[PDB]
Amino acid sequence: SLALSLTADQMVSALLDAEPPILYSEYDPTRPFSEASMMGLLTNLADRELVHMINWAKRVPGFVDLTLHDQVHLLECAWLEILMIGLVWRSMEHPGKLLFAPNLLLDRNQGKCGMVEIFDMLLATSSRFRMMNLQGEEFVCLKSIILLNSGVYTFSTLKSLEEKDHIHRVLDKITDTLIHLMAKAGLTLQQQHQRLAQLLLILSHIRHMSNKGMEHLYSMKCKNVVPLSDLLLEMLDAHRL
Amino acid sequence: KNSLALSLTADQMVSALLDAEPPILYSEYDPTRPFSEASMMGLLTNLADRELVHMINWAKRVPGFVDLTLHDQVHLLECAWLEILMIGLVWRSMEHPGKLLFAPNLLLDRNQGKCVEGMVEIFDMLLATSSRFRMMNLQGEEFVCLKSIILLNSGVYTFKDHIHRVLDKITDTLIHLMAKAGLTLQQQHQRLAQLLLILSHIRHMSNKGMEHLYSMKCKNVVPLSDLLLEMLDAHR
Amino acid sequence: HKILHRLLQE
Amino acid sequence: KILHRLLQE
Numbered sequence: 474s475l476a477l478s479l480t481a482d483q484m485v486s487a488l489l490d491a492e493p494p495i496l497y498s499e500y501d502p503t504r505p506f507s508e509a510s511m512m513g514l515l516t517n518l519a520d521r522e523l524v525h526m527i528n529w530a531k532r533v534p535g536f537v538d539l540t541l542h543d544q545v546h547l548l549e550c551a552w553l554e555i556l557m558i559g560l561v562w563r564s565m566e567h568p569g570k571l572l573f574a575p576n577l578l579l580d581r582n583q584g585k586c587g588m589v590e591i592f593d594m595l596l597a598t599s600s601r602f603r604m605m606n607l608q609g610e611e612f613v614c615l616k617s618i619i620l621l622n623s624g625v626y627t628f629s630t631l632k633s634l635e636e637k638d639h640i641h642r643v644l645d646k647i648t649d650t651l652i653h654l655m656a657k658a659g660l661t662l663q664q665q666h667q668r669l670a671q672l673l674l675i676l677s678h679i680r681h682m683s684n685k686g687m688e689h690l691y692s693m694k695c696k697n698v699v700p701l702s703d704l705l706l707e708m709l710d711a712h713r714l
Numbered sequence: 715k716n717s718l719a720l721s722l723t724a725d726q727m728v729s730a731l732l733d734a735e736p737p738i739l740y741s742e743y744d745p746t747r748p749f750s751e752a753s754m755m756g757l758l759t760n761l762a763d764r765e766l767v768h769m770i771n772w773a774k775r776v777p778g779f780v781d782l783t784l785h786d787q788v789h790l791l792e793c794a795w796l797e798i799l800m801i802g803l804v805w806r807s808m809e810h811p812g813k814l815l816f817a818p819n820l821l822l823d824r825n826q827g828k829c830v831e832g833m834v835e836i837f838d839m840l841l842a843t844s845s846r847f848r849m850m851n852l853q854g855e856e857f858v859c860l861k862s863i864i865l866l867n868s869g870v871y872t873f874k875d876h877i878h879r880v881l882d883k884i885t886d887t888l889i890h891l892m893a894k895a896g897l898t899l900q901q902q903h904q905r906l907a908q909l910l911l912i913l914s915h916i917r918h919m920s921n922k923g924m925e926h927l928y929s930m931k932c933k934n935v936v937p938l939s940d941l942l943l944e945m946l947d948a949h950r
Numbered sequence: 951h952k953i954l955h956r957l958l959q960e
Numbered sequence: 961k962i963l964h965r966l967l968q969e
């Protein structure tokens with residue numbers, strides 16, 4: 474594996490280089506939107522983002538070392554957490570608003586409809602990122618940690634266990650990379666450990682938001698007002714709500 | 715205004731948490747290995763209800779917790795209660811591979827989870843967490859730190875400074891314990907990360923468990939205490 | 951009114 | 961399975 478051979482700096486470079494683009498919504502400020510069609514823009518965007526996410530995952534060090542089956546599982550478990558952390562990242566410099574797309578910046582108001590609590594959680598996370606002054610280098614590390622960690626405990630044989638061993642080694646490498654970055658920021662050893670803890674505890678909140686979002690998506694399917702793509706429906710189904 | 719928690723030393727913190735530990739409770743002494751969904755879930759919810767009372771008194775003894783307003787204490791416990799029960803269960807079960815030690819006289823395996831529809835998935839996640847902890851050689855001093863982190867962290871971003879300062883102190887305490895155990899610098903930060911990442915899985919299990927408890931409530935077969943119902947209701 | 955309120959104070 | 965295919969190619 475070339476992944477376990479990367480220096481901290483090379484890891485950061487690889488991750489930054491692999492960042493997906495920020496996509497546009499079909500939002501039109503002159504057109505009227507219902508709670509439903511508003512949700513329609515967001516599900517349309519998520520579907521397009523998912524395609525880029527899949528191709529992004531292929532560039533995360535270590536990911537392609539895994540079996541197709543294991544890759545499928547990790548992405549099925551992590552996809553919404555990954556969309557959410559990306560959204561919170563984009564929104565960090567827009568206090569009280571979520572930048573779903575450059576042409577779609579919303580406050581909690583428009584977020585009509587369940588979705589209200591989720592919007593509030595996302596804003597709180599963005600606020601937290603802002604308090605901590607989260608750096609782009611730290612962000613890409615966190616996103617990759619989510620991809621690798623979220624599905625790791627929900628995977629047959631003792632050989633299928635080696636797959637998980639490799640994931641833990643890559644995760645350790647990303648931890649080393651985070652500490653390396655903080656050491657460069659001039660943080661004391663005590664400050665490094667504290668910040669590392671602070672960053673990882675946010676992942677618990679992101680998991681929570683994803684779980685809540687997954688249940689909201691399931692109710693949207695049931696109501697059949699908001700259009701959901703085949704990919705989104707398959708990703709939902711994978712959670713077996 | 716200033717909290718005594720922040721003035722404690724690492725050793726003092728560890729001792730305080732170890733001392734606050736709730737007792738391990740027993741289930742009913744009937745020899746009948748629960749096979750029905752009713753008897754099974756009946757035993758577990760009865761146990762959970764009794765554990766909750768001890769948890770509430772345990773929380774009051776976590777440094778920094780009583781310095782919060784009653785409303786904040788209520789919020790944190792409402793958000794964290796199931797995560798806290800689950801990490802406790804996983805800890806108790808660590809030395810019993812393949813088994814969940816709900817009580818000394820109630821040690822179950824995944825086969826028995828099948829009794830209750832929707833329970834085997836949750837049992838499997840708990841077993842995986844137990845195994846992970848066992849293979850990491852989780853120590854009791856580390857466990858109490860993680861459990862207190864859950865209490866203070868899980869609800870913090872749905873309200874701060876005080877709670878985050880206390881969280882930092884617990885982090886300091888965790889590193890203190892790892893250095894005390896002879897870990898190198900690289901091993902310390904790697905182990906810190908490994909442990910905190912498991913908290914993400916514990917959150918996930920809690921979320922799934924809450925959904926299962928909700929469905930149990932709607933089926934209306936198992937009797938649920940008013941306390942358990944209010945804790946469940948808080949999650950809307 | 952919540953039982954938790956009462957238990958946290960008792 | 962869409963995800964499976966997108967990952968493969």
Ligand SMILES: CC(C)(C)CC(C)(C)c1ccc(O)cc1
Pocket residue numbers: 515516518519522553556557559560573686690
């Ligand atoms: C769950 C869904 C992706 C449908 C909506 C939402 C608001 C959580 C979302 C949409 C796009 C995105 O990039 C992040 C989150």
Ligand SMILES: CC(C)(C)CC(C)(C)c1ccc(O)cc1
Pocket residue numbers: 758759761762765796799800802803816923924927
């Ligand atoms: C959610 C409930 C407490 C009903 C069940 C379960 C298996 C998660 C549980 C029960 C007791 C306990 O100490 C930990 C978890």
